[PDB]
Design a protein around this nucleic acid. Sequence first.
RNA 1: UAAAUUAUGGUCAAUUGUUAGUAUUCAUAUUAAUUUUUUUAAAUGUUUUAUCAUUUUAUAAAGGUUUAUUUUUGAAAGAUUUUUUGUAUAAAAUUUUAGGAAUAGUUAAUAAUAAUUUAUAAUUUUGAUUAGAUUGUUUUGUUAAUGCUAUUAGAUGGGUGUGGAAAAAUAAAAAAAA
Lengths: 51, 67, 51, 124, 211, 214, 107, 187
Amino acid sequence: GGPGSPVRGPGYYAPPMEGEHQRGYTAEWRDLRNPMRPPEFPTPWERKYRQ
Amino acid sequence: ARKHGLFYGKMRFAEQKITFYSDRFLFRDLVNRREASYANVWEMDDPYRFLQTEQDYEDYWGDNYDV
Amino acid sequence: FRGADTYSVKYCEQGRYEYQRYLMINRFPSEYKKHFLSFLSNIRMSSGSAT
Amino acid sequence: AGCRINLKATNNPKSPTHTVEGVFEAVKALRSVSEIAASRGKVPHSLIYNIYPYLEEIRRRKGMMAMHPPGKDGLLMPDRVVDNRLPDHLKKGYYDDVYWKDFFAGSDEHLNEPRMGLRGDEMR
Amino acid sequence: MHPRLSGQGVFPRYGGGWMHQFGHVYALQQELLNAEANNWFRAMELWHTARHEGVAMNVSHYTNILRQCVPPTAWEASLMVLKQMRRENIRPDVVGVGCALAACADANRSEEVEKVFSCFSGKLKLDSICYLALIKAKMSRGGYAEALAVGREQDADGVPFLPHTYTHLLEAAEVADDGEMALELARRMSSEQWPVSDRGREALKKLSTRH
Amino acid sequence: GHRLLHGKREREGSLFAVANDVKRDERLLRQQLNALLETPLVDLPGVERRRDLPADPITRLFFQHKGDHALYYGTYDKPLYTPIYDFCHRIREATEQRKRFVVVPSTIETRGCARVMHDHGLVAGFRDFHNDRAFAVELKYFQGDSTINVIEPCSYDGRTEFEWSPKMMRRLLNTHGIHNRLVVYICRTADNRIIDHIHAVKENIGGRGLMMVH
Amino acid sequence: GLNGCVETGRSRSEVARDLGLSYTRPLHENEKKQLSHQAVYYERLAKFKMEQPEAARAMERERFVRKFSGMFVKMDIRSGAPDFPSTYRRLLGTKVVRWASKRHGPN
Amino acid sequence: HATYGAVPLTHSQVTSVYATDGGKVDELGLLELVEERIFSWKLNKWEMRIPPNLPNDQKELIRQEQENLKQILSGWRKCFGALNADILQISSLTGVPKEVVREKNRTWLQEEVAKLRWMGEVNKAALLRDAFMRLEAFGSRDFMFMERLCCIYGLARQGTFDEAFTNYITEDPVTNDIFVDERNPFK
RNA sequence: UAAAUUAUGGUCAAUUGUUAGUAUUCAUAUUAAUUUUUUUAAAUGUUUUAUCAUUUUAUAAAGGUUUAUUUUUGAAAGAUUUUUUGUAUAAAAUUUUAGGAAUAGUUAAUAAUAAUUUAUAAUUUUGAUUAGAUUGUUUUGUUAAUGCUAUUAGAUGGGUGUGGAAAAAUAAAAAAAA
């Protein structure tokens, strides 16, 4: 996306990524179209909103 | 209401969302909501106890009921 | 178009500032000195006239 | 269903039999969910429908005593534990009678000896 | 002087989380199920308030109401609670019935304890305190033979004996001299390794003079 | 003084008994030297240290602890074209030939993917599954026809690799407008554990794509 | 003296200088000449200015006039740009012919 | 705190530094005082305890040792807090003085639980039973006595904790006189 | 070579339409058209001031070719004040050509403002320089599509050296000190 865009990787597939980048793209980056859970909060307040 | 020559359709679900059979907790939430829910709610039930005056009854049920 | 669409209850029952994730912002030591001096001067600005 | 045919790789793409032959060949090659599920060894609906207990059917078969935590003697079936077996809204009236001996029965030294005392007085 | 807790993140999801149009409902429910509440007048008044406000009440609300009535022994209020549950077809719990029996027994309303231990006698799996209530009610009017009878009834029903039941039944057998029954009780007590209470020790001492 | 070990062969330790060939196998020679180096050991798979033992009691029952005889285990050998590509190709060829066992290389991804195929019921079983070079897949047929219809790698060519996102996993689960538990897509997550798209979507994660099979 | 200071921002060289160490490669003759003939030219110029001041004054007047009476002496942004030929490319060729190319370095 | 000349201490040096003569003092009471002093700290008080001008290897080893000490003290802090919470719970439920709760027995527990269950409080009786069963295993006035005393001895060995147990402005509980208490229970 | 252990003592299935989302028509769409309309003729009044002057009033077009920039504190905002001290000048990264090669007011160092100096300097086949095309431009259009396709935000080293800043020969108007 570049300067102003929040998007960090392509929508569906991308080139191989390593270390923290792979971890983020696979699991940790914000996925706002998820229908089961919304983006996940930091550690101390994800537990109390789990349900 | 409808217009001429437009052949309107029908919408089956209000929204696009994950089904409740896909999770144990969604299933339990729906079961609890159904038990807390009516099955057929009428003009006499609790949710309409705020129509305490006959004029309120008439204005709510006569026109602007959609509103 | 999406006339009836809802969102999770986490969104409406989250506390304030629960979503802020801790990220370590990095900046040059020259930037550190510049900003620290600027903040110190702003703190030390004398009141009465316009502050 | 949806079907698409590319004929530009044929000598005569204008021939009339090509489309029908291709559609019938594809239908021949197509397999049913019943056949797929039977060949794999599982029910047909578990491959089409989103019901949450179907997650158990894609995993392999494992012993019940191996999956559930062991007891004091080792492996035991989870169904032999009274707490596992009983609903929580039933273990207040008669469960208490049953287990009173569990907590409040024992030898005289067991029932009258306070364990809540100094345990280093002699060495000090 | 405030709702015990009211806001985001304290109420079940399936209800829509926190709907501010039902804050009174949530506060009323928490006060109804307040476990630290011990004012039985407050319990009756809160039940009436909930009745007017149309909040569905389970068996646990009535159980709390009854639990609040034992220390003061408002047996009549407990019986009215049971009558209302009969009217609404809300089945009481073993603990709620035991609370009613305890109120009546400590109030010495042996007739009412006898009546209550006939409506739920065969259907509900009553327990040791429910049988102790009959034992106490019978010994109140002085039916020690019938106290021994209800002891055998408990034995037949299969719910075990507890030290309080042993003490009361031993007292009954002591006053009405039943050497064989007391031998049975003492042998069972020794087998089960119960802590012998002072009352049971005195009963056994008085009986040892006989046997 | 101290000399550092450069290659994996030197780091893992290698005699290099042969004259100059540095890439000679050595697995067998080391296996028989270790064997005669001893009989309290059974032919069940060994594990080098106790805490590596499986969590499942029944699998712990099959596994035994051996100090350094847990290494070099295995009977088969390793038979461009990355291991997943070659694994898919061999299984497809053997299935079309209506064979029983397919000896296929054993890497982390290939082995996990074969385990996932077993879980979903596309392979009858395995042989020599604890080998770290190659393992045999016992293919399953039903009424003359093979259970596996098509099996192909994510990298259709041997070169290009991909990274599936959680949106991609949900895409696969709802492919073509259906609910798709029929064709199974395998992805290796950021934790180096191989899962299918059902579990990936249930867990809200993706990973590197391995293959698809049905 | 091989790692700069992360917090102070000092380079490898400043860290070594502060430690009192010296990490300098063996220099060739031309490199040593570069580092040696800095002082000789300064001394030659200073001695020239001290010895014959008429010619020195003439040359200094020439420099000063050539600068003062010169275009592009504003010290504006255009003059302050480091690489004029590449920052301002459309000028070259059709407007400015001083530079016959737009690239003189790695940028 | 850390000092430019502070150093760790060995056993002989600790004995020489704290070489004092005494005839009678309650180890348990003084240990409780020192532990309450430790518990009434902020995490900051553990900060500047590594003596500087000390080689990096010994510095790191002292860091592990002090972190182990702090973790053990925090674990005992949590255990002590839970034990006192259970003591208050039992005292409130039964009505007995909380002082004599520590010398009760299973017969008394049975009788009290029976009274609670008779009065119709099954959950409350369960709370009392769980608290007593959980507390008969953790309530000994000297429960981890050796661990606690070894932790205090390790603090003494560190050599940077001698001064954190004094110079506190306290107030007389009875006369309400504000003063500076110089007594060193750690010493 | 482990050899077919007799509790068969618990059967009574599935379906209740409830959703974790790129989906494919080689001919329908898509354009100039079958439906394209509607007007437009220049020659011009910003302002206040102490008056032949001074103060306030900084991005019109065509052409030429375009790196990928810009917080003059300096004017105003603006105040119990006071500076033309309130750090504006920098960097990273993404271009095109059917017949593919050399480029230079040149690189770094410097007690050198304003370079008489020193060096085996610098750009380029990982595609430079010049020439040709040429504002950029996830905004347009199309598709099942990370494919194809389209575009007007601007900028401007010799016209006064004035000004805080050249952006200064035209101004659908952003109200410009009652």
